[PDB]
Structures are given as C-alpha cells and as structure tokens.
Design an enzyme around this catalytic site. Sequence first.
Site, PDB file in Angstrom:
ATOM      1  N   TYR A 293      -3.472   5.790   3.315  1.00 15.89           N
ATOM      2  CA  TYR A 293      -4.510   5.405   4.254  1.00 15.89           C
ATOM      3  C   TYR A 293      -3.935   5.353   5.660  1.00 15.89           C
ATOM      4  O   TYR A 293      -4.509   5.892   6.584  1.00 15.89           O
ATOM      5  CB  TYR A 293      -5.101   4.053   3.853  1.00 15.89           C
TER       6      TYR A 293
ATOM      7  N   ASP B 197       0.855  -1.178   0.000  1.00 17.65           N
ATOM      8  CA  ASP B 197       0.000   0.000   0.000  1.00 17.65           C
ATOM      9  C   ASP B 197       0.895   1.234   0.000  1.00 17.65           C
ATOM     10  O   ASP B 197       2.099   1.139   0.304  1.00 17.65           O
ATOM     11  CB  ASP B 197      -0.975  -0.022   1.175  1.00 17.65           C
TER      12      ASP B 197
ATOM     13  N   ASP C  17      -7.407  -8.111   0.868  1.00 14.90           N
ATOM     14  CA  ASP C  17      -6.484  -8.187   2.004  1.00 14.90           C
ATOM     15  C   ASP C  17      -7.235  -7.743   3.229  1.00 14.90           C
ATOM     16  O   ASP C  17      -8.138  -6.906   3.139  1.00 14.90           O
ATOM     17  CB  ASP C  17      -5.272  -7.248   1.836  1.00 14.90           C
TER      18      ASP C  17
ATOM     19  N   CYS D 168     -11.379 -28.577   7.829  1.00 20.09           N
ATOM     20  CA  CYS D 168     -10.151 -27.890   7.474  1.00 20.09           C
ATOM     21  C   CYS D 168      -8.953 -28.814   7.308  1.00 20.09           C
ATOM     22  O   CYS D 168      -8.696 -29.667   8.155  1.00 20.09           O
ATOM     23  CB  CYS D 168      -9.855 -26.858   8.540  1.00 20.09           C
TER      24      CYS D 168
ATOM     25  N   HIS E 171      -4.162 -21.505  11.273  1.00 20.90           N
ATOM     26  CA  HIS E 171      -5.484 -22.015  10.909  1.00 20.90           C
ATOM     27  C   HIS E 171      -6.331 -20.921  10.189  1.00 20.90           C
ATOM     28  O   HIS E 171      -6.949 -21.203   9.163  1.00 20.90           O
ATOM     29  CB  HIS E 171      -6.276 -22.469  12.126  1.00 20.90           C
TER      30      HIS E 171
ATOM     31  N   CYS F  30      -5.328 -28.178  12.334  1.00 21.68           N
ATOM     32  CA  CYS F  30      -6.484 -29.049  12.501  1.00 21.68           C
ATOM     33  C   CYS F  30      -6.132 -30.532  12.384  1.00 21.68           C
ATOM     34  O   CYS F  30      -6.861 -31.382  12.885  1.00 21.68           O
ATOM     35  CB  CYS F  30      -7.584 -28.645  11.537  1.00 21.68           C
TER      36      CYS F  30
ATOM     37  N   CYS G 171      -5.795 -27.848   7.321  1.00 23.99           N
ATOM     38  CA  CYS G 171      -4.546 -27.246   7.773  1.00 23.99           C
ATOM     39  C   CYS G 171      -3.791 -28.104   8.791  1.00 23.99           C
ATOM     40  O   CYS G 171      -4.361 -29.018   9.410  1.00 23.99           O
ATOM     41  CB  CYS G 171      -4.754 -25.810   8.270  1.00 23.99           C
TER      42      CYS G 171
HETATM   43  C1  LIG Z   1      -9.507  -1.847   6.457  1.00 23.84           C
HETATM   44  N1  LIG Z   1     -10.146  -1.006   5.461  1.00 23.84           N
HETATM   45  C2  LIG Z   1      -9.470  -0.371   4.506  1.00 23.84           C
HETATM   46  N2  LIG Z   1     -10.079   0.449   3.619  1.00 23.84           N
HETATM   47  C3  LIG Z   1      -9.077   0.982   2.824  1.00 23.84           C
HETATM   48  C4  LIG Z   1      -9.072   1.934   1.829  1.00 23.84           C
HETATM   49  C5  LIG Z   1      -7.870   2.320   1.255  1.00 23.84           C
HETATM   50  C6  LIG Z   1      -7.832   3.414   0.277  1.00 23.84           C
HETATM   51  O1  LIG Z   1      -8.832   3.985  -0.139  1.00 23.84           O
HETATM   52  N3  LIG Z   1      -6.582   3.772  -0.142  1.00 23.84           N
HETATM   53  C7  LIG Z   1      -5.438   3.141   0.268  1.00 23.84           C
HETATM   54  N4  LIG Z   1      -4.275   3.585  -0.240  1.00 23.84           N
HETATM   55  N5  LIG Z   1      -5.445   2.123   1.128  1.00 23.84           N
HETATM   56  C8  LIG Z   1      -6.670   1.713   1.645  1.00 23.84           C
HETATM   57  C9  LIG Z   1      -6.675   0.735   2.663  1.00 23.84           C
HETATM   58  C10 LIG Z   1      -7.891   0.405   3.273  1.00 23.84           C
HETATM   59  N6  LIG Z   1      -8.161  -0.448   4.350  1.00 23.84           N
HETATM   60 ZN   LIG Z   2      -7.413 -25.588  10.359  1.00 23.01          ZN
END
Ligand SMILES: CNc1nc2cc3c(=O)[nH]c(N)nc3cc2[nH]1
Ligand SMILES: [Zn+2]
Lengths: 371, 371
Positions: free
Chosen positions: A97, A93, A268, A306, A337, A311, A308
Amino acid sequence: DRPRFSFSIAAREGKARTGTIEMKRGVIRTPAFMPVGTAATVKALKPETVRATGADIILGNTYHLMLRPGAERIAKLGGLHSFMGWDRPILTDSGGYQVMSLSSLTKQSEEGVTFKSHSRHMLSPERSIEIQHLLGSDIVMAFDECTPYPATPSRAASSMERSMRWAKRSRDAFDSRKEQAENAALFGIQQGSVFENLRQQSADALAEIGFDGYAVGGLAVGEGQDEMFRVLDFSVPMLPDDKPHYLMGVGKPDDIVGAVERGIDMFDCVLPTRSGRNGQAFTWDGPINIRNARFSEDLKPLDSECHCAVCQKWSRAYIHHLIRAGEILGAMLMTEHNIAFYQQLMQKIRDSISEGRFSQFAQDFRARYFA
Amino acid sequence: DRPRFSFSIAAREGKARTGTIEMKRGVIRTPAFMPVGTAATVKALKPETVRATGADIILGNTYHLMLRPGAERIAKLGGLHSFMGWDRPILTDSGGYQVMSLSSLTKQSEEGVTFKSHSRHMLSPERSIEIQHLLGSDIVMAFDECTPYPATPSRAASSMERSMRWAKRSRDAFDSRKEQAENAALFGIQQGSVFENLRQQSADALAEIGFDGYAVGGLAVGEGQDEMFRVLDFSVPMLPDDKPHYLMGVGKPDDIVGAVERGIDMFDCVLPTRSGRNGQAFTWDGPINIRNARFSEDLKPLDSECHCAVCQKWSRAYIHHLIRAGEILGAMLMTEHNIAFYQQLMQKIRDSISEGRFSQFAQDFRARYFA
Ligand SMILES: CNc1nc2cc3c(=O)[nH]c(N)nc3cc2[nH]1
Ligand SMILES: [Zn+2]
Ligand SMILES: CNc1nc2cc3c(=O)[nH]c(N)nc3cc2[nH]1
Ligand SMILES: [Zn+2]
C-alpha cells in the site's frame, strides 16, 4: 508459555465478537486498536506511555523501515522490538500500500514493484516477507496490491487475481523460513474493491491457502462510510469465522464501532496520532480543535470522563497554549490523550460485547458523539 | 513548614560552597542548575520527567510569557505553577535581557523599555515585578539593563548606574505587594561589564538596597571563558557571602565547574535542551553529535555511566535514527539525557565540595571531558 498464535472468542453479539489472540510476546485483547509506529516510533510517545494507554500491539511498516534505517540494519541491531524498546507484539504491513501511496515513480509487474524512494528499491512477495522477518514482526502481512478506488470490475478482478497469486507466494516464503514460521503469524489480505463476487473469490482463495488471520484490504481509500459499511456487510462473513478479521487503515471512532458491528476484530490508523499533533482531540462529545480561541481560558481537561494522565493533570487552556506555540509537549499531551481515548473506546466495546449490550452502547455512543 | 527564603551553607572548599535554599514550594540544593522553561514548558519534557532528572527549580521568562499566553491570563488560570504542572520553585528573569535580544524595535528610557513583539509592549521595573507576581514566581529577578559586550567604560558606567536605580525601583515595587513580599524572594543583578571598579560600585549599591540573592549579570554575552572567569575572579567576592550567587545564562559544563570554583551557586542555560534537540549529547568524555554516521550501528547508550532512563533503555543507534528522521521522540530522549547529565554534574559538584575533594573532581572532570 504462550503459543505462537491462538485466537479465542469469549463472547458474541450479532456479528460482533470479543476475545483474545495469544502470541509469544503477549496477549492481544480484541477488538483491538493498534497505534501506528511507522518510523520505529509511535510519534511523540515512549513505548511505556503507549502501553500505559492500554495498547497491546502496535503497527510498523515494511516500506518506511526498509528505507530508513534499513531492514538489514535493524536485524543487525537485534530487531525492531529491541531497537525501539517495545517488547510486545508488532504487526507490520507488507509495503504494497505504502509503495503506491508514497513513492514518486513505480514500475509494477507480476514479480513485484520497483520504486524510487520518497535511490531505487524493489518489493516482491519474497522480499516483503524477508524484510518483515528481519524486522522480527510478530504478525506478518501478505504482500498484496491495494486496488485504487474507484475501480472498474475488470481492473478490480485482474488486481485481486494478482494479489491472490502473491498471497500464495507470501505463504510459501513465510513457511520456508523456519524461525519465522515457528514464531510469527501470517495474515492474508482480501481484495476485490466494492464487488461482492470478487470479494467472494478472494476470500475463497485466501481460505484455500490458509492464514492465521484475514484482513479486509482495499477500503478506507476514499469510498466513504456508507460504501465501506456496505462492502463490509457482505465481505466479512466470507472470511473464516474462527480467525481474526483486520480492517486495514480504519479509522474514525464511528467507523470502528460500525466495523465491529460487522465482525471486525482489529484496527489501525494514524488519526489519533497525526490529528493529535494538529490540534484535534477526541472526546465523548465529538472531536474538538484545541487551537480554537474558545479554549484559551478553559480550565477543564480535554475530556470530562477520560482517565488518561493528560486529563488528570493539564487543562485545555494549557494544551491550547502549547499547540499554538508549536511546543513539543503539546504534541506529546495531545497524542497520549488521543491514543488513550481510542483504547478506552476499544475497552468499552469489548466490555459491552462481553455483557451483551454492545447494540445499546453503539446507540448511546452515537447519540452523544454526534449530538 | 518551610520559610519564605533561607540559604544555608553546609560545606566550603576555597571559594566553592554547597548548601540549600529553603522556600515555601521546596528545597533547592546548591550549586543548582535550572532547566529553562521559557514558554511555560521545559521543551519536550513533562514536569515529572524534569523532576525525575533531579531538578529542584526551573527558570521561566517575563518576556516570552507576557507575550504568549499573557501574564494576566496565566494569573486568571491560577498561576504558572498550576498552568504548567510544576509545583516546585520557579525563578523568572525580569525581561530586560530578552527584550534587547529578541525584540525587533525598542525604545529605551529611564522609565523602562518599549518594544515591538517578535503589537507594542512596555516593560519597566514596576511592570516587570508585577508580571512576575502575576506568574506567581518564587524567585523574582530585579529589572535591569544587560550591558552589551564589549562596552566602553563610560557606557558600562551609565548603564550600570541606570540598572542600580532600577534595582531600587524593583525592590520597592516588590515590597509594596504584600503577598509577593511574603511568599517570594527578590534577587538583585550586578552589572558593570568587565570593569572591576564598576562591578564594585554595583555590588555596593545592591548590598545597600538589600536582596535575598545576587546575580552576576552582563556575562555569557560573547566574551569567552577566559574573560568571564577573569571577571568572576574579582566580582563574586564583592557580593554578600551569606546569600546565593547566580550566574545568569551559564553554561557549558566546564563553565559551570569553573564558575563554582569562583563562588557561584546557581546556573541556567538552554544548552542541554536546545542542543539536545539539535543532536548534541553530553557525555563524561565530552559532547557527541548523535547525527554522525559513526553512531548508526552503535548499541551503547549515549553515555556509559549515566544513570538516566534514556541510557538505561535505548542505544545511540536508535536515537541517531530518531534525530535523523526528525522524530519527536528523538528530541524527547536527547533532552531528558542532557538535563539528567547536567543534574548529575551538579550532584557530583555538590558531593565533592561536601567531601573536600572538589579541586580533585574539577581536575579529573577536565582531563576526561577534554581528552
Ligand atoms: C488508511 N487506509 C488504508 N487502507 C488500506 C488498505 C490496505 C490494503 O489493501 N493493503 C495493504 N497491504 N495495506 C493497506 C493499508 C491501508 N490503509
Ligand atoms: Zn485524556
Ligand atoms: C545566555 N547568556 C545570558 N547572559 C545573561 C545576562 C543577563 C543579565 O545581565 N540580566 C538579565 N536580566 N538576564 C540575563 C540573562 C543572560 N543570559
Ligand atoms: Zn543518560
């Protein structure tokens, strides 16, 4: 040898797609879930264990790593992949954010953001792309502004417009760095809050610049599933069909299923790792809290199906004891897990789309998970 | 199939010995180091990782487990081996040391000890042996009183005499339980503080009762190496030569080498695990503190010769970052390396005794470790 970047769609069902992204460091099966490795580690797991659960790619963060251990330091040590021992693709990223989420003081301007560490630091489109280069990221995110929720239409618009200017700056910074342009990929981030016209303007701007993939930004920030899904309904079709669609920060298993139904290819979130350490285990019958006394003498594995390693070998009773005791092995077993469960969910999603039975899978999944 | 218990000495050099203990659940190579797994886990390691470092046996504790999760509970769940996933021998301490170390209030009598948990609880020779049976321990320790250091001769004597009465009670409790007597082994614990005549009386009492092995108790309690070694010099030869000699709670690598020179076959301590989590890494050039800034950009492994998986794959710089960040993976990697180092130390000790060059090994080890 693999290309710098190639996305291929193998099968479709409605708006859902399954396929692969080929990159120099490996193949990513989509829809994909990326375990989060914010401090150059997926918490409580060796990289071989992350891979053994089925992960093809992990997420790192420009924000945390630029503060500790430092982007330049990581570059001097040979890059993030060598440093943490993960040799497959890494998406990072851009910092936009996390700075607004975790910094104590921030000053925002058209140039970028200055902030106080959770010493002073600056992020701009140029510096963000540079840090992601120093880390050696394979998928670089454009530097954006994540609009807070809720936003008025005027503030959402102003914010989105700034993000589009920063997207062009991100593109140019990335392209100017020959080694990065040749070996990594760049994704743009759509903004516009919950407003269809602003989402359309942002999609148009991003497509005009041109990116390797497109993220839906500005969601999973408090709006709730109904609203998230409503915004995805109109926003995802605005993005180029032939490139990956990445929903940043999502999410719970049902959010992932519904987002795939709406055309998302990449995910993610910290939920499986963070909530794993807190005692929440995912199962096909819904989450359980292993700390609960009802598990103190339960010899069954965390989940009955599961595959894994956790488990295969340990009981709920044992893991209950470890988590109640604050033992590190408890965090390890719960996290392995939960990450494995998430990967099994993505595998079932991929296989059901490939077989034309994803709608049925989603229905069966929900009936059982929410029974 | 293996016997309940058989100790065989393959080679000797001076007072040092190397050999094997055969038990139903496995072979133990001696001299042996037992990683400590007080809360039914060796902290931050899966049992497969403990085994991969070379451990043949681990130590559990009557005291911690009787409090959490409970001895009866562990028995109902199938015993400690099944519960934690370690299928090889487990030695359990009897509780007598930990109660006096960790309990907030204690009442001592000829019957045993009553104490407040760190609810009220009791330990006696009979209850201790019973708890170790419920856990399914392979090597059961007699219930003793660890005499505080320093002790006057009169108090050391009174304490040792009580421990010998409790040793006989331990023997009888163990023998009365047919399944335990047939499948596990019982070790007696020599007491007597630093006093040669009391050590001799205690050895004589223990040999008259008869045990499968003999521990030297009452040391590693603040006396320092010179004094410990002086007491071992006369105490170990008092014990039966043909049974294992176990030095409880020792210790640092140089303490282990000197104790083997004095006839000790078995060791345990929390140092490699606990200090690993705190940033101390063992190396053949002495311990280092990985938190130190000097390691922030050091690409070398923790130790230059170590064959462990941590040293194969990660740098000092990375582990430095993890430990400074408080990351769980840092605890994992430091603990695996330190346990592996301890096992490599025991392997070098065994091989040098087998080859008649242990004296030389001890000299070379010290010259380098303390350079
Ligand atoms: C956990 N929720 C979450 N919403 C997001 C939006 C953005 C976004 O709009 N921009 C960037 N750069 N990272 C993000 C990471 C996030 N993480
Ligand atoms: Zn498991
Ligand atoms: C860390 N130092 C240490 N000295 C010990 C002595 C005894 C002892 O004399 N008796 C019993 N039962 N455990 C022990 C454990 C020890 N641990
Ligand atoms: Zn090592």
